[PDB]
């Protein structure tokens, strides 16, 4: 069960969940596999925080193993649209989609824990049906692959040609190596 935390508000004591209390501090946790329903919650959280105080920056702690690419795009599109800088702090693990969101964070606010491990690979999708349907369905997969390389390369800063070869197969980048690659500005070794 989620623990309950009490906030020492002057008007009266306020009861909150651990996630809700942290959300009041513009902290959002991207935990679990990427999905349409879970992604919707993150979008709703970002919208609420931006309206409450667009001047303050929003934080995103990514500890997800990846998932559906389409669901993740909603988070990516909303991250740039909202005025608050979407800080991305990779924690524990960053898969292809999780890594994509990590780079999406505002420049200068992207961080990785000292022992955090990142993984980047090409989207995996398959379709079954008539030959004509597979060709058109397959074409969209390749088209999407180009789109991810373009957006990832822009934030990372790596050349498009290098991204294709690296993205062809799974690439595990340790936290120091991620800074070299350009995924994160620096590592939060200690306070």
């Amino acid at each position: 069960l989620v623990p309950m935390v009490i906030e020492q508000t002057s008007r009266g004591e306020r009861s909150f969940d651990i996630y809700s209390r942290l959300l009041k501090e513009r902290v959002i946790f991207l935990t679990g596999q990427v999905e349409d329903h879970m992604a919707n919650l993150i979008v709703a959280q970002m919208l609420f925080l931006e309206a409450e105080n667009p001047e303050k920056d929003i934080y995103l702690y990514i500890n997800s193993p990846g998932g559906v690419i389409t669901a993740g795009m909603s988070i990516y599109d909303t991250m740039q649209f909202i005025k608050p800088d979407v800080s991305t702090i990779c924690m524990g693990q960053a898969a292809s989609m999780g890594a994509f969101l990590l780079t999406a964070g505002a420049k200068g606010k992207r961080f990785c824990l000292p022992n955090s491990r990142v993984m980047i690979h090409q989207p995996l999708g398959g379709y079954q049906g008539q030959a004509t349907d597979i060709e058109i369905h397959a074409r969209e997969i390749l088209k999407v692959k180009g789109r991810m390389n373009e957006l990832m390369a822009l934030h990372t800063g790596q050349s498009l040609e290098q991204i294709e070869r690296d993205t062809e197969r799974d690439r595990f980048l340790s936290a120091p190596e991620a800074v070299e690659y350009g995924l994160v500005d620096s590592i939060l070794t200690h306070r």
Partner: protein, 275 residues
């Protein structure tokens, strides 16, 4: 008009008025002019301070001293001091609901009873109120990917904030239209005219360009705050630069002043001549 005709109950108060919109919607102006036109002393009590048990006691209680028995209810004695004086209330939304209930009592019976035993008659006083609920809701932005106007009807806010019986006893809900930009331009001229007459006594002559008045109008006046910031904006912008020169500089004698703005940098340029 109803009270003057006399086709009404004697106990019922002379008039019931209401005001809505941002702070500084001419509540003081119309009330002061209305009081002047009716030849009744203007009495104004601010509900903004009535937010605590000690402060809310002030209406019928004697905050100055418990030993003091002459003052009694400060709001109540005010009516007693001047029978025809108008009562101006502002920011009533803040006040507790319990305090607002006593207002309903006097409105119905047109009479009040002080703790000390004094009886006050409301048959000769007009009661007006001011509400600023609109600014809080409209300034807020909708929680959506694309923003939307958050303006709401003033009458809607009166209904939610106040109990239904208050509106029923109230003769009508009066909503004052919002300020217009033309009035703001005239307001800027009035302040300059006020400053102008003040300078003429010292012997200093100030001339202001028409473009300068418009420039101050855009940044100074605010929709949420009405014309209150424009007043303050005119004081710091004009009094501060001349003040240094008046003590020592070109304006010590002659007092030739010119006011103009530069379109390229969009900043006011002040020209001082020794004269």
């Amino acid at each position: 008009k109803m009270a003057r005709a006399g086709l009404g109950h004697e106990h019922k108060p002379v008039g019931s008025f209401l005001f809505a919109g941002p702070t500084g919607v001419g509540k003081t102006e119309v009330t002061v002019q209305l009081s002047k036109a009716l030849g009744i002393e203007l009495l104004r009590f601010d509900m903004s301070e009535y937010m605590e048990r000690h402060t809310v006691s002030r209406l019928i209680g004697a905050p100055p001293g418990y030993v003091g028995f002459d003052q009694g209810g400060l709001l109540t004695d005010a009516v007693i001091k001047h029978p025809h004086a108008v009562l101006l209330l502002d920011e009533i939304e803040k006040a507790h609901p319990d305090v607002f209930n006593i207002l309903l009592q006097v409105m119905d019976n047109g009479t009040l009873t002080d703790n000390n035993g004094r009886k006050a008659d409301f048959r000769n006083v007009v009661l007006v109120m001011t509400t600023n609920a609109g600014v809080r809701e409209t300034e807020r932005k909708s929680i959506g990917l694309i923003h939307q106007d958050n303006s709401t009807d003033a009458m809607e806010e009166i209904k939610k904030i106040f109990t239904p019986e208050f509106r029923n006893r109230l003769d009508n809900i009066i909503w004052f239209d919002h300020l217009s930009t033309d009035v703001i331009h005239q307001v800027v001229d009035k302040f300059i005219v006020e400053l102008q007459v003040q300078l003429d006594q010292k012997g200093v002559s100030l001339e202001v360009s028409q473009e300068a008045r418009n420039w101050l109008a855009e940044k100074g006046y605010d929709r949420a705050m009405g014309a209150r910031p424009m007043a303050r904006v005119i004081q710091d912008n004009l009094k501060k630069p001349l003040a240094n020169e008046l003590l020592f500089g070109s304006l010590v004698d002659g007092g030739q002043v010119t006011v103009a703005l530069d379109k390229e940098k969009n900043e006011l340029t002040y020209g001082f001549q020794s004269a």
